[PDB]
């Protein structure tokens, strides 16, 4: 049933979870200036660059291992992923180029290529379920039937088997993460935007999962929406901003907890839930980020590693804070007095202690 | 410029061809009805059986090396093949399933399966150009740009780089061949069953390469087709078949020589041209079977073999003729003795001498 958090808790975060720092390492051929999605594979660490569009392979270390493809305009060649995902056989990694529309197919064993196709239609990010089929985002808001649903389940091939959650807010600016679908074992789960629920979705089933609700908040109503955007014809996101509601949320799901970023009178909050013993916790950002002793976190990465939130910090930012004498975490601290100006950034894996 | 084809001619068909016979192997796994096309590949035989739509792999003695692919609604499995292609650089095999409206891409070393992509449009057959771009014939006939062509010239990736040769006559009902493009060398050639030329078609040009003409006959009009057809609408064919235009007309061509197989008030012919003397040599194919010694020829298989054109011949049809007394050529009737009641056909390879 309902997840509540309310504004405020009294309760340190450093208490209730447990920390971990991995170093990046950094060379020419694997320059990093965002982690925007991370998987694991065997032992290594699939990440995607979403700001400069590069799918690179590194190690549970830390260490490089090999860039999946490469940019560019050719075959195998991209110019801007949006997201990627490994098929459950673990045969193939399927990266999505939005710029080129097209998928391109990698080997998940040694990261050549394989083939290229063109993406059925207007869309970001994909995820294979158990029985096989794909579950793909709908970027729709045309005549298109595509354009009246948020999601669609298609086969191997991308025929269209069945077309999923009814979207009565239509635009063509988006609010919400790039990446709105994930994994909890083998069960694929969605989200939209405008809706604090989270729904299990397979090939002939919506059942809803998890539902949220925050004190003194909540997301936009449909009237709120249409009149701020004249009908999805203008960019409403101003105008959610000014507002007491939920401008932006993404969610990220384990097996033990459950993390939901989220926006609120121009301010980052983050809401942690433990399954275990059914408890929440929210907090201001600026209130988590010095609770933890790590100075800043702009984001969390979308994805996890052995049920850990992936959230990268950057060096020159923190190692000023440093030298102006910020009261680091003593891990931290010990790889930052290591780490170069230039170097990529510091993960952060955290996650609810047992 | 011309090929003037005179209806008769009094030189024996024995004298300005040489012969050759092959005689395919006959196992449960490699049985064969129809030899629709064949493509050399190595010291290999591709042979499509577009009868019951396997591809099969035979070597230049006749034996059965392996099938590609297999029957099916799966990935990598097909219904119903009108055609197939290998890549310039001899990498892949691209087989096109016209029952389920994708394209099926197997190894060209191993014959394993690697990927598979749906059809762009409604079309039965393809060929690379030596730029890389892939040259298809447009099977539609409804609002559709692609429909008022015979060709379309695509990427890589399948997206329209230009559409080549105005189609006026427009139907749902085709009256040519199946495969109407082939190569020469390098370059990619293509015909269209209402016009007496054959065209050199890149990626910027169409430049005609050959024209005919017939004695005593030739292509139907516009205005015949129309009248006979309702405007497209209805089966024209059984009303071409009873006048004394072409119905139906093949080509094949190679460095030496070009065949051109047709139909003519309800008769088969055949052309042959002598490209090193300039001579043609028209032969009605109940003569010209008799002639050459092989009893039937019901029918030339698209392509050739080291510059030989090939014709498929049933053994058991054979065979009875045989056992009636029917004067056959010298290395046939070798073969055809040692051949039993169910063998599959017996490849006849023949070419203009030099």
Redesign the interface.
């Known amino acids: 049933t309902i997840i509540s958090f309310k504004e405020h808790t009294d309760v340190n975060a450093d208490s209730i979870l447990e920390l971990s720092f991995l170093k990046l390492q950094t060379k020419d051929s694997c320059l990093v200036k965002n982690v925007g999605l991370i998987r694991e594979l065997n032992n290594c660490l699939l990440i995607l660059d979403s700001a400069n569009s590069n799918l690179y392979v590194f190690n549970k270390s830390g260490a490089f291992v090999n860039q999946i493809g490469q940019k560019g305009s050719g ?1 195998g060649e991209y110019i801007l992923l949006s997201s990627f995902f490994v098929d459950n056989n673990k045969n193939y990694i399927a990266a999505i180029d939005i710029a080129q529309d ?1 998928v391109l ?1 990698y080997n998940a064993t040694d990261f050549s290529f ?5 993406l059925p239609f207007s869309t970001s990010c994909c995820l294979q379920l158990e029985d096989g089929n794909l579950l793909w985002n709908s970027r729709e808001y045309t005549d298109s039937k595509l354009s009246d649903f948020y999601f669609v389940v298609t086969d ?4 269209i088997i069945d077309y999923k959650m009814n979207k009565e807010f239509k635009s063509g600016y988006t609010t919400g993460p790039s990446q709105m679908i994930y994994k909890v074992g083998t069960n694929v789960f969605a989200y939209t935007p405008f809706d604090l629920t989270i729904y299990r979705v397979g090939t002939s089933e919506i059942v809803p999962a998890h539902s949220f609700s925050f004190e003194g908040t909540d997301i936009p109503s449909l009237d709120f929406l249409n009149k701020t955007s004249n009908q999805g014809n203008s960019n409403y996101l101003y105008d959610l901003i000014q507002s007491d509601y939920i401008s932006y949320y993404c969610v990220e799901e384990t097996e033990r907890d459950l993390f939901v970023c989220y926006m609120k009178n121009k301010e980052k909050y983050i809401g942690l839930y433990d399954k275990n013993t059914d408890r929440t916790y929210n907090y201001p950002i600026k209130i988590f980020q010095d609770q933890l002793k790590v100075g800043e976190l702009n984001y969390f990465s979308i994805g996890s590693v052995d049920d850990y939130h992936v959230a990268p910090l950057d060096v020159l930012s923190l190692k000023d804070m440093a030298g102006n004498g910020y009261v680091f975490d003593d891990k931290l601290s010990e790889l930052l007095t290591i780490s170069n100006e230039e170097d990529n950034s510091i993960l952060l894996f955290v996650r609810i202690k047992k």
Chains 1, 2 share one sequence.
Do not use: A, H, N
């Open positions: 075959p097209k197919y394989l083939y290229e196709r063109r191997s091939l991308f025929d």
